[PDB]
Amino acid sequence: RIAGVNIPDNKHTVISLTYIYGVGRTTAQSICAATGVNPAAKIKDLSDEQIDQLRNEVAKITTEGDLRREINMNIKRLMDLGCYRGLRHRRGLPVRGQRTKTNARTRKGP
Amino acid sequence: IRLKAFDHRLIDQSTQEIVETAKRTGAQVRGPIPLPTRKERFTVLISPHVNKDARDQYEIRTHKRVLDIVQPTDKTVDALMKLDLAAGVEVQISLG
Amino acid sequence: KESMKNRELKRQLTVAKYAKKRAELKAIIANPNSSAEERWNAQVALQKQPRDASASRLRNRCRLTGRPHGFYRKFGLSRNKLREAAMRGDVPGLVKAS
Amino acid sequence: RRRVAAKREVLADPKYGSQILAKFMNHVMESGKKAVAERIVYGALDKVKERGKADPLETFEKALDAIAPLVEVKSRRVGGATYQVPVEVRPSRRNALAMRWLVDFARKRGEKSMALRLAGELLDAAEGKGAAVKKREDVHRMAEANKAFSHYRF
Amino acid sequence: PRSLKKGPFIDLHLLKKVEVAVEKNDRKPIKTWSRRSMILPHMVGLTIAVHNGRQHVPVLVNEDMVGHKLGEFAATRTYR
Amino acid sequence: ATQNYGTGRRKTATARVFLRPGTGKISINNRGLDQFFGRETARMVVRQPLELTETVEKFDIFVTVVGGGVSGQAGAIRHGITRALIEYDETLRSSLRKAGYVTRDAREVERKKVGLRKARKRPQYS
RNA sequence: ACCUCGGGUGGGCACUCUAAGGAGACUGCCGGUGACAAACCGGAGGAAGGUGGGGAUGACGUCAAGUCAUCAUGGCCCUUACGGCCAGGGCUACACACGUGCUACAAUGGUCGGUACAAAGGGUUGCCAAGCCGCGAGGUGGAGCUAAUCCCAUAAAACCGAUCGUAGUCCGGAUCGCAGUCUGCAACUCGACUGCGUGAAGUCGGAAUCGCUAGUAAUCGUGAAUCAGAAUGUCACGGUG
Ligand SMILES: [Mg+2]
Ligand SMILES: [Mg+2]
């Protein structure tokens, strides 16, 4: 609603744009370069004018409310085909080819 | 002139076999100059079936040695090369 | 084994037999100025050769013993035949040091 | 245990002209980061000169001698009963006990701007309300309950 | 992986046992031990008997299977 | 003449130190002394044998040092200039033998041994 | 002297360095101490002082310790296969438990912009520069080179300025989606790196328990062997201390 989500205050611009969930850190360094907003000032000190140009960039990359939708179909395409990358992805095993006998605990919990 | 061998009880004992046997024939040959030495360490395991922390490490050396003529007018050392090579000395010629 | 040295002897023949066409077939593909029609038929000549011609199929074993692991290429010996042949003064220029 | 241990000496402080401060600087250094720890000790030295008009060496000279203790226990077990014996602290040892207590309570001060943590420690011990002074006097109180074991099965 | 300079990969004996086997259409499964090759839009809808390791398993080729190789659709290890 | 050659080695460093009469000319590798050693206490440690022998103002100093570490080169100069000061006489010999400046520090690094991980640290067992 | 200001050049053999051959250290000398006898405690000189520091060198033997799968051999069995040949698979599976090892948990820090100093080693079946095109890994390009010459090859921490205000964070980086390059006939099970995105557990860790007496612990990098490709391990060399 503010830029797609709420944006914190009393912070620099590149840090503030990070919470938009679809722009990391290197991408938000291009947006202040392409628009011209100084990151060295806070978001409080800005004008209420050029935020549309920041909002123009949000309408060109992705939005987290639909980013998580479309990335699920990338998962969902892998599951319903029954390919090996979606075979373990149904179950909960690691995917990229890690070791399974021990230590793969961030995909199985405590 | 440059010389390569494996032990200093040959290669630094064959320069006098060249310095004396060339300065005798008139031409001036200056004092030989040492070079840095090749050193290669080989750590090998020693037990047939395994016990890792028992090891043994060797080293193979290579001594270098460079001569320097002043006036080339002697083919005397060109015939006396089979004399100056004895067992393990290799001589590449740089007749300066 | 002895039957296992013998099957990896003839791999060294078949690599060193052909050895020149596969340089040419990899000279064609590696050029950015090469045409893909000249590349695609060059792909045909690689896979129809017997696969025991690449160097990656070749395995440098010990020459006197045959043991795969523990091989050095500044010698031709194994890990444990090199020790027995060096203590008998054979290998020239090789001593212990610190 | 043949007696072996000789003495090695470190005494160098050119930018201030001191000797106790150099030995104190070694108790602040972690993993050989000397140039980092050098500007923090001077960084907590000038804040005292900012705070007090006196030369801050003498603040440090006073803050040692209200953290440095006099007697302490020594659990020498008789071999069948665990005893503790209050012993006189050797005069050479009693410098390093204060300087080691001082740094370890600076790290749990919990402020911002790290040289301000050590700044507040050297201000308190010229008065006595520091946690190092409260840790000093509590171990002093442990000796008199232990004072019955001073010579007898000691 | 398999960078775009060297674009496609398919096996030679597989190709003549498919491209000629398109001209007489799908009345048989293709029994093949090869697993290193991709599938291609010249092959949408066929029936392949990919080698498990100890048997062949049938494959129903669809249109949205195109980039992935045959190895993702034969099993290796059971874990019942 | 009055040119005096001084060498000194500490922690795999080596410093050519030349010493001749002048007025405070302290130059090292065509750099000033405050510029070369950036922000350390060893900016004064190179002066410590000099100001002990009360000759801080009476000589030109030309230093060329190679190899070593940052604060290892500063020790090479301090050992190096003490050999250059004692080319004069042995009047300042006793002023430096007592000072502990003339002896070269022999403490060099130690090699990794097999079984161990560092020079003396070894892995944990149970 | 020269210079275009680069030992660039002429030159020099002072030096550093390199490596050959030597001297030096023996309780030698001074005092005290002991049976004044081995020795011991102090002292001078000296680069070094009491086996200067390190390394290789492990007695008679022990545990029928380990290895017939490195190799060698007594015997025993197979010899239409317990031997050979070729494809795919496998050893990298996976509620769990134990062993070593790496990062972290932040402000003695985190980023950005400048800037300073190493040793040791590999390279004519190789190193693969300059220029050059790529967000980046790289692609072209082909020099120089058989090595104190050429390349690997930019040491990092430290220092200087800036922001960051101690917040599960401009902390941390696991997972995962997408897009790429390199080797190899071939990256599905099963390789390494690069881009972009997402961002977890973790706020110093019980009972217990191990390493180390000085260029040592602690911390920061670099190289080699094996090797088409692939190191948090092994071996090896230095910084700060
Ligand atoms: Mg004892
Ligand atoms: Mg490799």
PDB file of C-alpha atoms (C1' of nucleotides) in Angstrom, chain G:
ATOM      1  C1'   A G   1      78.224  10.312 -15.704  1.00  0.00           C
ATOM      2  C1'   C G   2      73.802   9.388 -18.384  1.00  0.00           C
ATOM      3  C1'   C G   3      68.676   9.857 -18.654  1.00  0.00           C
ATOM      4  C1'   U G   4      62.842  10.126 -21.319  1.00  0.00           C
ATOM      5  C1'   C G   5      64.168  10.084 -14.571  1.00  0.00           C
ATOM      6  C1'   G G   6      62.559   3.473 -15.087  1.00  0.00           C
ATOM      7  C1'   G G   7      69.515   0.641 -12.564  1.00  0.00           C
ATOM      8  C1'   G G   8      66.425   3.208 -17.871  1.00  0.00           C
ATOM      9  C1'   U G   9      71.797   3.329 -19.617  1.00  0.00           C
ATOM     10  C1'   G G  10      77.073   3.349 -19.551  1.00  0.00           C
ATOM     11  C1'   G G  11      79.427   1.619 -15.445  1.00  0.00           C
ATOM     12  C1'   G G  12      81.092  -0.164 -10.670  1.00  0.00           C
ATOM     13  C1'   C G  13      82.522  -5.157  -7.527  1.00  0.00           C
ATOM     14  C1'   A G  14      81.245  -1.017  -2.032  1.00  0.00           C
ATOM     15  C1'   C G  15      77.030  -3.708  -0.942  1.00  0.00           C
ATOM     16  C1'   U G  16      72.444  -6.700  -0.266  1.00  0.00           C
ATOM     17  C1'   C G  17      71.806 -11.433  -2.008  1.00  0.00           C
ATOM     18  C1'   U G  18      73.261 -16.252  -3.562  1.00  0.00           C
ATOM     19  C1'   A G  19      76.681 -20.818  -2.172  1.00  0.00           C
ATOM     20  C1'   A G  20      81.139 -22.885  -1.456  1.00  0.00           C
ATOM     21  C1'   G G  21      85.016 -23.146   2.025  1.00  0.00           C
ATOM     22  C1'   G G  22      86.212 -21.721   6.869  1.00  0.00           C
ATOM     23  C1'   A G  23      86.763 -19.619  12.170  1.00  0.00           C
ATOM     24  C1'   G G  24      83.291 -18.996  16.899  1.00  0.00           C
ATOM     25  C1'   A G  25      81.512 -21.750  22.674  1.00  0.00           C
ATOM     26  C1'   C G  26      85.055 -25.164  25.509  1.00  0.00           C
ATOM     27  C1'   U G  27      82.105 -24.135  32.311  1.00  0.00           C
ATOM     28  C1'   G G  28      86.964 -21.065  28.590  1.00  0.00           C
ATOM     29  C1'   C G  29      87.822 -17.019  32.259  1.00  0.00           C
ATOM     30  C1'   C G  30      86.424 -14.153  37.565  1.00  0.00           C
ATOM     31  C1'   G G  31      84.405 -14.918  42.445  1.00  0.00           C
ATOM     32  C1'   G G  32      81.842 -17.927  45.993  1.00  0.00           C
ATOM     33  C1'   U G  33      80.356 -22.894  47.203  1.00  0.00           C
ATOM     34  C1'   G G  34      81.619 -29.064  47.389  1.00  0.00           C
ATOM     35  C1'   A G  35      85.637 -33.961  50.148  1.00  0.00           C
ATOM     36  C1'   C G  36      87.829 -28.551  46.727  1.00  0.00           C
ATOM     37  C1'   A G  37      85.751 -33.969  43.237  1.00  0.00           C
ATOM     38  C1'   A G  38      82.963 -34.329  40.388  1.00  0.00           C
ATOM     39  C1'   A G  39      79.623 -30.333  39.911  1.00  0.00           C
ATOM     40  C1'   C G  40      76.547 -26.129  41.553  1.00  0.00           C
ATOM     41  C1'   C G  41      75.272 -20.654  42.253  1.00  0.00           C
ATOM     42  C1'   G G  42      76.587 -15.869  40.752  1.00  0.00           C
ATOM     43  C1'   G G  43      80.281 -12.462  37.181  1.00  0.00           C
ATOM     44  C1'   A G  44      82.898 -10.278  32.966  1.00  0.00           C
ATOM     45  C1'   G G  45      83.502 -10.445  27.769  1.00  0.00           C
ATOM     46  C1'   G G  46      80.664 -11.858  23.618  1.00  0.00           C
ATOM     47  C1'   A G  47      76.286 -12.273  17.657  1.00  0.00           C
ATOM     48  C1'   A G  48      75.397 -16.310  20.770  1.00  0.00           C
ATOM     49  C1'   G G  49      76.567 -19.079  28.029  1.00  0.00           C
ATOM     50  C1'   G G  50      76.195 -23.161  30.189  1.00  0.00           C
ATOM     51  C1'   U G  51      73.337 -30.056  25.886  1.00  0.00           C
ATOM     52  C1'   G G  52      72.145 -21.576  21.703  1.00  0.00           C
ATOM     53  C1'   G G  53      66.747 -23.073  19.083  1.00  0.00           C
ATOM     54  C1'   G G  54      64.788 -26.931  15.744  1.00  0.00           C
ATOM     55  C1'   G G  55      65.131 -31.774  12.885  1.00  0.00           C
ATOM     56  C1'   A G  56      66.542 -36.712  11.480  1.00  0.00           C
ATOM     57  C1'   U G  57      68.455 -40.749  14.881  1.00  0.00           C
ATOM     58  C1'   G G  58      64.106 -44.695  18.796  1.00  0.00           C
ATOM     59  C1'   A G  59      68.312 -50.274  22.883  1.00  0.00           C
ATOM     60  C1'   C G  60      66.947 -55.973  24.757  1.00  0.00           C
ATOM     61  C1'   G G  61      61.721 -56.542  24.145  1.00  0.00           C
ATOM     62  C1'   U G  62      56.250 -56.457  24.608  1.00  0.00           C
ATOM     63  C1'   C G  63      50.828 -56.845  22.660  1.00  0.00           C
ATOM     64  C1'   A G  64      50.252 -64.708  18.390  1.00  0.00           C
ATOM     65  C1'   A G  65      48.637 -55.899  17.968  1.00  0.00           C
ATOM     66  C1'   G G  66      47.747 -54.827  12.076  1.00  0.00           C
ATOM     67  C1'   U G  67      48.221 -56.229   6.799  1.00  0.00           C
ATOM     68  C1'   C G  68      47.544 -63.093   2.354  1.00  0.00           C
ATOM     69  C1'   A G  69      43.661 -56.414  -0.669  1.00  0.00           C
ATOM     70  C1'   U G  70      50.836 -53.331  -2.122  1.00  0.00           C
ATOM     71  C1'   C G  71      54.162 -57.143  -3.013  1.00  0.00           C
ATOM     72  C1'   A G  72      56.540 -62.493  -1.778  1.00  0.00           C
ATOM     73  C1'   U G  73      55.162 -67.433  -0.132  1.00  0.00           C
ATOM     74  C1'   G G  74      53.429 -72.914   2.647  1.00  0.00           C
ATOM     75  C1'   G G  75      48.749 -75.281   2.314  1.00  0.00           C
ATOM     76  C1'   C G  76      43.604 -75.459   0.908  1.00  0.00           C
ATOM     77  C1'   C G  77      39.547 -74.890  -2.657  1.00  0.00           C
ATOM     78  C1'   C G  78      37.426 -72.996  -8.048  1.00  0.00           C
ATOM     79  C1'   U G  79      39.280 -74.232 -13.414  1.00  0.00           C
ATOM     80  C1'   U G  80      32.294 -74.619 -19.125  1.00  0.00           C
ATOM     81  C1'   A G  81      33.914 -70.437 -14.006  1.00  0.00           C
ATOM     82  C1'   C G  82      34.825 -68.322  -7.465  1.00  0.00           C
ATOM     83  C1'   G G  83      38.037 -67.215 -14.321  1.00  0.00           C
ATOM     84  C1'   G G  84      37.535 -63.429 -18.799  1.00  0.00           C
ATOM     85  C1'   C G  85      34.428 -59.423 -21.976  1.00  0.00           C
ATOM     86  C1'   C G  86      30.629 -54.936 -22.532  1.00  0.00           C
ATOM     87  C1'   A G  87      26.712 -51.941 -21.350  1.00  0.00           C
ATOM     88  C1'   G G  88      23.487 -49.261 -17.442  1.00  0.00           C
ATOM     89  C1'   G G  89      23.134 -49.184 -11.694  1.00  0.00           C
ATOM     90  C1'   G G  90      25.986 -48.906  -7.175  1.00  0.00           C
ATOM     91  C1'   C G  91      29.675 -47.386  -3.237  1.00  0.00           C
ATOM     92  C1'   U G  92      27.316 -40.156  -2.708  1.00  0.00           C
ATOM     93  C1'   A G  93      20.341 -44.257  -0.067  1.00  0.00           C
ATOM     94  C1'   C G  94      18.554 -42.426   5.429  1.00  0.00           C
ATOM     95  C1'   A G  95      13.376 -41.566  11.706  1.00  0.00           C
ATOM     96  C1'   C G  96      18.338 -41.968  14.180  1.00  0.00           C
ATOM     97  C1'   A G  97      23.423 -42.176  17.638  1.00  0.00           C
ATOM     98  C1'   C G  98      28.939 -41.149  18.237  1.00  0.00           C
ATOM     99  C1'   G G  99      33.883 -39.047  16.336  1.00  0.00           C
ATOM    100  C1'   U G 100      36.906 -35.170  14.430  1.00  0.00           C
ATOM    101  C1'   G G 101      36.585 -29.979  11.349  1.00  0.00           C
ATOM    102  C1'   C G 102      34.758 -25.290   9.637  1.00  0.00           C
ATOM    103  C1'   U G 103      31.934 -20.894   9.882  1.00  0.00           C
ATOM    104  C1'   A G 104      28.890 -17.805  12.963  1.00  0.00           C
ATOM    105  C1'   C G 105      26.166 -15.807  17.040  1.00  0.00           C
ATOM    106  C1'   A G 106      28.360  -9.108  16.183  1.00  0.00           C
ATOM    107  C1'   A G 107      30.124  -2.452  17.576  1.00  0.00           C
ATOM    108  C1'   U G 108      38.384  -4.938  19.911  1.00  0.00           C
ATOM    109  C1'   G G 109      32.583  -4.989  14.675  1.00  0.00           C
ATOM    110  C1'   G G 110      29.784  -4.407   9.442  1.00  0.00           C
ATOM    111  C1'   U G 111      30.075  -1.918   4.624  1.00  0.00           C
ATOM    112  C1'   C G 112      32.199   1.810   0.881  1.00  0.00           C
ATOM    113  C1'   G G 113      36.187   4.725  -0.992  1.00  0.00           C
ATOM    114  C1'   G G 114      41.252   5.146  -1.167  1.00  0.00           C
ATOM    115  C1'   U G 115      46.465   3.070   0.211  1.00  0.00           C
ATOM    116  C1'   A G 116      51.392  -0.175   2.833  1.00  0.00           C
ATOM    117  C1'   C G 117      54.865  -4.205   3.517  1.00  0.00           C
ATOM    118  C1'   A G 118      56.060 -11.106   2.495  1.00  0.00           C
ATOM    119  C1'   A G 119      58.287 -15.900   2.184  1.00  0.00           C
ATOM    120  C1'   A G 120      58.042 -20.458  -0.305  1.00  0.00           C
ATOM    121  C1'   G G 121      56.792 -23.240  -4.725  1.00  0.00           C
ATOM    122  C1'   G G 122      55.295 -24.708  -9.921  1.00  0.00           C
ATOM    123  C1'   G G 123      55.456 -23.896 -15.504  1.00  0.00           C
ATOM    124  C1'   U G 124      58.174 -26.254 -23.784  1.00  0.00           C
ATOM    125  C1'   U G 125      52.761 -32.338 -24.082  1.00  0.00           C
ATOM    126  C1'   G G 126      52.876 -26.512 -20.148  1.00  0.00           C
ATOM    127  C1'   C G 127      52.357 -21.180 -18.084  1.00  0.00           C
ATOM    128  C1'   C G 128      48.850 -19.021 -21.191  1.00  0.00           C
ATOM    129  C1'   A G 129      50.482 -11.889 -20.678  1.00  0.00           C
ATOM    130  C1'   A G 130      49.219  -6.818 -23.365  1.00  0.00           C
ATOM    131  C1'   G G 131      45.040  -5.446 -26.080  1.00  0.00           C
ATOM    132  C1'   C G 132      40.029  -6.971 -26.281  1.00  0.00           C
ATOM    133  C1'   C G 133      34.594  -8.172 -25.334  1.00  0.00           C
ATOM    134  C1'   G G 134      31.371  -9.673 -20.756  1.00  0.00           C
ATOM    135  C1'   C G 135      26.681  -7.428 -14.301  1.00  0.00           C
ATOM    136  C1'   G G 136      30.352 -11.711 -13.209  1.00  0.00           C
ATOM    137  C1'   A G 137      32.401 -16.583 -13.578  1.00  0.00           C
ATOM    138  C1'   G G 138      34.888 -15.704 -18.525  1.00  0.00           C
ATOM    139  C1'   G G 139      35.455 -15.431 -24.266  1.00  0.00           C
ATOM    140  C1'   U G 140      38.829 -13.781 -27.829  1.00  0.00           C
ATOM    141  C1'   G G 141      43.971 -12.657 -28.528  1.00  0.00           C
ATOM    142  C1'   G G 142      48.641 -14.608 -28.916  1.00  0.00           C
ATOM    143  C1'   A G 143      53.250 -12.627 -26.719  1.00  0.00           C
ATOM    144  C1'   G G 144      57.231 -14.085 -23.601  1.00  0.00           C
ATOM    145  C1'   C G 145      59.167 -18.718 -22.009  1.00  0.00           C
ATOM    146  C1'   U G 146      62.705 -23.703 -20.949  1.00  0.00           C
ATOM    147  C1'   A G 147      63.988 -20.234 -16.660  1.00  0.00           C
ATOM    148  C1'   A G 148      67.197 -15.583 -10.110  1.00  0.00           C
ATOM    149  C1'   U G 149      65.073 -13.236 -17.278  1.00  0.00           C
ATOM    150  C1'   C G 150      58.805 -14.749 -19.039  1.00  0.00           C
ATOM    151  C1'   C G 151      54.185 -16.149 -16.684  1.00  0.00           C
ATOM    152  C1'   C G 152      51.637 -18.223 -12.345  1.00  0.00           C
ATOM    153  C1'   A G 153      50.881 -13.482  -9.138  1.00  0.00           C
ATOM    154  C1'   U G 154      46.620  -9.026  -6.978  1.00  0.00           C
ATOM    155  C1'   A G 155      49.384 -11.431  -0.316  1.00  0.00           C
ATOM    156  C1'   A G 156      45.418 -10.543   3.673  1.00  0.00           C
ATOM    157  C1'   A G 157      45.129  -8.647   8.575  1.00  0.00           C
ATOM    158  C1'   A G 158      47.147  -3.274   9.707  1.00  0.00           C
ATOM    159  C1'   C G 159      46.562   1.926   8.443  1.00  0.00           C
ATOM    160  C1'   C G 160      43.030   6.560   6.261  1.00  0.00           C
ATOM    161  C1'   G G 161      38.044   8.786   5.408  1.00  0.00           C
ATOM    162  C1'   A G 162      32.875   7.856   5.377  1.00  0.00           C
ATOM    163  C1'   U G 163      28.322   5.858   6.929  1.00  0.00           C
ATOM    164  C1'   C G 164      26.258   1.780  10.393  1.00  0.00           C
ATOM    165  C1'   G G 165      23.931   2.924  16.749  1.00  0.00           C
ATOM    166  C1'   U G 166      24.067  -3.002  19.366  1.00  0.00           C
ATOM    167  C1'   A G 167      18.048  -4.198  16.253  1.00  0.00           C
ATOM    168  C1'   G G 168      17.440 -11.502  14.975  1.00  0.00           C
ATOM    169  C1'   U G 169      20.109  -6.356  12.870  1.00  0.00           C
ATOM    170  C1'   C G 170      23.219  -2.758   6.561  1.00  0.00           C
ATOM    171  C1'   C G 171      24.085  -9.743  11.975  1.00  0.00           C
ATOM    172  C1'   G G 172      24.315 -14.487  10.018  1.00  0.00           C
ATOM    173  C1'   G G 173      24.449 -17.189   5.838  1.00  0.00           C
ATOM    174  C1'   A G 174      21.648 -22.795   5.465  1.00  0.00           C
ATOM    175  C1'   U G 175      17.695 -23.801   2.270  1.00  0.00           C
ATOM    176  C1'   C G 176      15.298 -22.898  -2.349  1.00  0.00           C
ATOM    177  C1'   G G 177      13.421 -20.597  -7.445  1.00  0.00           C
ATOM    178  C1'   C G 178      15.414 -18.707 -11.898  1.00  0.00           C
ATOM    179  C1'   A G 179      19.546 -17.579 -15.364  1.00  0.00           C
ATOM    180  C1'   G G 180      24.688 -18.635 -17.009  1.00  0.00           C
ATOM    181  C1'   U G 181      29.938 -20.078 -18.084  1.00  0.00           C
ATOM    182  C1'   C G 182      34.233 -24.342 -17.827  1.00  0.00           C
ATOM    183  C1'   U G 183      36.168 -29.353 -18.376  1.00  0.00           C
ATOM    184  C1'   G G 184      34.737 -33.971 -20.485  1.00  0.00           C
ATOM    185  C1'   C G 185      31.795 -38.517 -25.748  1.00  0.00           C
ATOM    186  C1'   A G 186      28.644 -37.497 -21.594  1.00  0.00           C
ATOM    187  C1'   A G 187      27.043 -32.775 -15.394  1.00  0.00           C
ATOM    188  C1'   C G 188      19.546 -37.207 -14.391  1.00  0.00           C
ATOM    189  C1'   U G 189      20.748 -40.242 -10.134  1.00  0.00           C
ATOM    190  C1'   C G 190      26.251 -37.417  -9.057  1.00  0.00           C
ATOM    191  C1'   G G 191      30.777 -32.015 -10.336  1.00  0.00           C
ATOM    192  C1'   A G 192      32.643 -26.946  -9.407  1.00  0.00           C
ATOM    193  C1'   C G 193      31.915 -21.950  -9.709  1.00  0.00           C
ATOM    194  C1'   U G 194      28.772 -17.046 -11.393  1.00  0.00           C
ATOM    195  C1'   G G 195      24.368 -13.795 -11.590  1.00  0.00           C
ATOM    196  C1'   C G 196      19.575 -12.546  -9.546  1.00  0.00           C
ATOM    197  C1'   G G 197      15.780 -13.463  -5.758  1.00  0.00           C
ATOM    198  C1'   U G 198      14.260 -15.574  -1.014  1.00  0.00           C
ATOM    199  C1'   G G 199      16.036 -15.681   3.706  1.00  0.00           C
ATOM    200  C1'   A G 200      16.177 -19.965   8.370  1.00  0.00           C
ATOM    201  C1'   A G 201      18.514 -22.069  13.032  1.00  0.00           C
ATOM    202  C1'   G G 202      21.646 -19.290  15.815  1.00  0.00           C
ATOM    203  C1'   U G 203      21.652 -13.659  21.375  1.00  0.00           C
ATOM    204  C1'   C G 204      28.597 -17.451  23.572  1.00  0.00           C
ATOM    205  C1'   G G 205      26.274 -22.867  24.221  1.00  0.00           C
ATOM    206  C1'   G G 206      24.671 -28.700  30.651  1.00  0.00           C
ATOM    207  C1'   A G 207      27.014 -32.782  33.250  1.00  0.00           C
ATOM    208  C1'   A G 208      31.504 -33.225  31.511  1.00  0.00           C
ATOM    209  C1'   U G 209      36.546 -32.658  28.616  1.00  0.00           C
ATOM    210  C1'   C G 210      41.010 -31.672  25.545  1.00  0.00           C
ATOM    211  C1'   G G 211      45.432 -28.595  23.449  1.00  0.00           C
ATOM    212  C1'   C G 212      49.704 -25.272  24.740  1.00  0.00           C
ATOM    213  C1'   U G 213      55.515 -22.667  28.522  1.00  0.00           C
ATOM    214  C1'   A G 214      57.573 -18.064  23.565  1.00  0.00           C
ATOM    215  C1'   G G 215      58.103 -16.115  17.747  1.00  0.00           C
ATOM    216  C1'   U G 216      54.466 -20.376  21.571  1.00  0.00           C
ATOM    217  C1'   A G 217      48.985 -20.139  21.931  1.00  0.00           C
ATOM    218  C1'   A G 218      45.465 -16.935  19.139  1.00  0.00           C
ATOM    219  C1'   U G 219      44.188 -14.742  14.494  1.00  0.00           C
ATOM    220  C1'   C G 220      45.164 -13.319   8.631  1.00  0.00           C
ATOM    221  C1'   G G 221      46.622 -14.986   3.917  1.00  0.00           C
ATOM    222  C1'   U G 222      49.859 -17.819   0.100  1.00  0.00           C
ATOM    223  C1'   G G 223      51.680 -22.447  -2.388  1.00  0.00           C
ATOM    224  C1'   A G 224      52.341 -27.704  -3.678  1.00  0.00           C
ATOM    225  C1'   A G 225      51.360 -32.935  -4.213  1.00  0.00           C
ATOM    226  C1'   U G 226      47.106 -36.307  -6.315  1.00  0.00           C
ATOM    227  C1'   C G 227      44.514 -34.029 -10.784  1.00  0.00           C
ATOM    228  C1'   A G 228      40.442 -33.522 -17.766  1.00  0.00           C
ATOM    229  C1'   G G 229      37.293 -31.574 -14.077  1.00  0.00           C
ATOM    230  C1'   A G 230      36.616 -31.264  -8.262  1.00  0.00           C
ATOM    231  C1'   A G 231      39.626 -29.541  -0.597  1.00  0.00           C
ATOM    232  C1'   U G 232      36.587 -26.746   5.128  1.00  0.00           C
ATOM    233  C1'   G G 233      41.249 -32.371   4.680  1.00  0.00           C
ATOM    234  C1'   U G 234      46.976 -33.504   4.219  1.00  0.00           C
ATOM    235  C1'   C G 235      51.739 -31.465   3.699  1.00  0.00           C
ATOM    236  C1'   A G 236      54.442 -26.797   3.437  1.00  0.00           C
ATOM    237  C1'   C G 237      55.891 -20.946   3.876  1.00  0.00           C
ATOM    238  C1'   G G 238      55.135 -16.339   5.955  1.00  0.00           C
ATOM    239  C1'   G G 239      52.517 -11.704   8.448  1.00  0.00           C
ATOM    240  C1'   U G 240      50.607  -9.470  13.528  1.00  0.00           C
ATOM    241  C1'   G G 241      51.741 -11.279  18.192  1.00  0.00           C
TER     242        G G 241
END
